[PDB]
Amino acid sequence: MEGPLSVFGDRSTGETIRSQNVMAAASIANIVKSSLGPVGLDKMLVDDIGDVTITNDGATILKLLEVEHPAAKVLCELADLQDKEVGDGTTSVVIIAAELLKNADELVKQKIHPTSVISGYRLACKEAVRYINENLIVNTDELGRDCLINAAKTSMSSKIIGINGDFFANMVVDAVLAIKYTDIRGQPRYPVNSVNILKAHGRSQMESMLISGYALNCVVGSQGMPKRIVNAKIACLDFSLQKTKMKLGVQVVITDPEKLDQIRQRESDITKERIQKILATGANVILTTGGIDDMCLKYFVEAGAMAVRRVLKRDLKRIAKASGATILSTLANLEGEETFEAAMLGQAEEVVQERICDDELILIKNTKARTSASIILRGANDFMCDEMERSLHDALCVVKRVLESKSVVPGGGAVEAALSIYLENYATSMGSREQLAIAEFARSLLVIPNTLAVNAAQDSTDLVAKLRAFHNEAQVNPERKNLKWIGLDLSNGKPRDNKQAGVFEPTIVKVKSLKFATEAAITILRIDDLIKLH
């Protein structure tokens, strides 16, 4: 290490270990800097020797990494803790820590009521959080001009592979409402990941078709058996048909192979009676769980059956609740001998079979017991559909995070660029200790976006030139609007004009990243005295 070598035990007794900490602290945050923002480089990282990981997420990077110092240690928590918060702000919290812990001690050492020093880095977070609660100036999915449409359209402009954001602005609107699940505090916000979403190759590259009710993907082209009668009903089954062994409990060990062949012979033929019990109930569309053997399949192909099998249970579960059906009612056993009662029937205006794209789905029109939707994605291929689907997801969580918190900020350190000089100003008249802290605080803010800038090769001089120009006493004002531009696009690394974009972040992860950053200033400092052990 540095300075005195006289005592082991990571006791360098003051500035040495403190600097050996700021060294370690400035050592760990480095990967994050190059990894900061979507323009953060993607790090192939050797796990053992030939064992490697390619990751641009510092937190993920940190998780493979080990902590060789408390300085290395205290950040890899708070970073992974801010990762544990969301995963928005992982890289954010990391860097500023390395600056403040040479900043933090310098004041708190001088005592004179030693308690309150690092609160100069805390009250600043408060001062920031307030302002951070004040920023609709950039990043609005709270309302756009088309609201969640344009909010997603600008978010589909935030992730944009094409003119997508035309139907895809609407899909994300369709998506948040497609999902209906109990969400608490009263949220009409419903999770955006569970949205039933299907990929369609061919037709138009950029296009979407919203399914009334949830769209159940049901197997066609493998089972040639008709599942199709246009109906008002669906029988939602959690049940399986097998022509090899439908109900087990037989041992290959028994001296009699007849016992395994017998229930095989018998219970292979009961598979096609179960449906006849369901059809006679009035069910002309019966949604059955799959798992038939490749032999049992072609048998079910050549022997034939009336049923809808190998449906998506993610949709089947959603549709069971949606159409009012259950997936299990009278099913006490693996035997196809079981009768069927209408309890597993879903109720709908009609259940009509629409095969589109050369993919037949179970499309439940008027899912009765909830509101349901699924937006199928028309693209050249499913990779082209993979292309826009991911572009849709960051039109989702942003709306979601906005539906999580109406108050937001623009993502990135651009909110600092305002706050920083303001908080350095908010430090100025404080004077004494307090002009130091809040300014020594706010100067350490600047590292995040500028590093993120040069991560995009944005000439970080530019990033500060643009933002803190607009930031003034003229504009101290986030307002709700732009008389200054406090926004920073992260995949751009440069402030853009997008005030709705889906690549920003709400006030949620940002009020957090402040304190965690103030924490690492404190987090290393609690030790009283020092020693060494034998």
Residue 123 or 270 with smaller CB distance to another protein: 270
Separation between Cα atoms, residue 323 and residue 344, nearest integer Å: 10
91 assigned binding-site residue: yes
Do residues 166 and 395 make contact, with C-beta atoms less than 8 angstroms apart?
Answer: no
Residue 47 interacts with another protein (CB under 8 A)?
Answer: yes
Binding mask 216-245 for another protein (x = CB under 8 A): -----x---------------------xx-
- Residue 249 engages another protein in binding (rule: CB under 8 A): no
Q: Is 394 tagged catalytic?
A: yes
Q: Which residues contact 48 (CB under 8 A, 6 or more apart)?
A: none
Catalytic residue among 60, 91, 154, 451: 91
Can residue 44 be called a binding residue for another protein (CB under 8 A)? yes
User: Is 281 assigned a ligand-binding role in the annotation?
Assistant: no
User: Do the annotations mark residue 513 as ligand-binding?
Assistant: no
> Is 345 within 8 Å of 235 (Cβ atoms)?
yes
Helix H or strand E encompassing 46: strand 43-46
Number of residues counted as binding another protein (CB under 8 A): 52
Q: Where are the beta strands (DSSP E) in 338-484?
A: 345-356, 359-365, 373-378
Which of 1, 7, 41, 248: binder of another protein (CB under 8 A)? 41
**Smallest separation, CB 287 to another protein (Å):** 23
Output the smallest distance, CB 47 to another protein, in A: 4
* Residue 89 known to bind ligand: yes
How near is the Cβ of 493 to another protein at its closest, in Å? 9
Among the residue ranges 44-52, 135-143, 277-285, 387-395, the one whose residues contact another protein (CB under 8 A): 44-52
Binding to another protein (CB under 8 A) within 427-466 occurs at: 456-457
Does position 61 interact with another protein (CB under 8 A)? The reply is: yes
State the alpha helices, DSSP H only, in 258-351. Answer: 258-268, 271-279, 294-302, 313-323
Count of Cβ atoms closer than 10 Å to residue 396 Cβ: 25
* Among 8-16, 184-192, 201-209, 247-255, the segment contacting another protein (CB under 8 A): 247-255
Query: Can you tell me the distance from the alpha carbon of 502 to that of 142, in angstroms, rounded to the nearest whole number?
Result: 11
CA 47 to mean position of chain CA atoms:
25
Known catalytic membership, residue 90 = yes
Q: Based on CB atoms, which residue is closest to another protein, 243 or 496? A: 243
For 398-409, letters b (16+ CB in 10 Å) and e give bbbbbbbbeebb
Q: Of how many residues is the chain composed?
A: 534
User: Least CB distance from residue 53 to another protein, whole Å?
Assistant: 8
- Rounding to the nearest 10 degrees, give the CA dihedral for residues 132, 136, 141, 145: 180
Q: Is 1 in the site for another protein (CB under 8 A)?
A: no
Task: Report whether 508 contacts 404 (CB < 8 A).
Answer: yes
Instruction: From the candidates 141, 174, 394, 489, give the one annotated as an active-site residue.
Output: 394
281 included as an active-site residue: no
Task: Confirm or reject binding of residue 30 to another protein (CB under 8 A).
Answer: yes
Which residues have a catalytic role annotated?
Answer: 57, 90-91, 394
Q: Which residues are annotated as a binding site for Mg(2+)?
A: 88
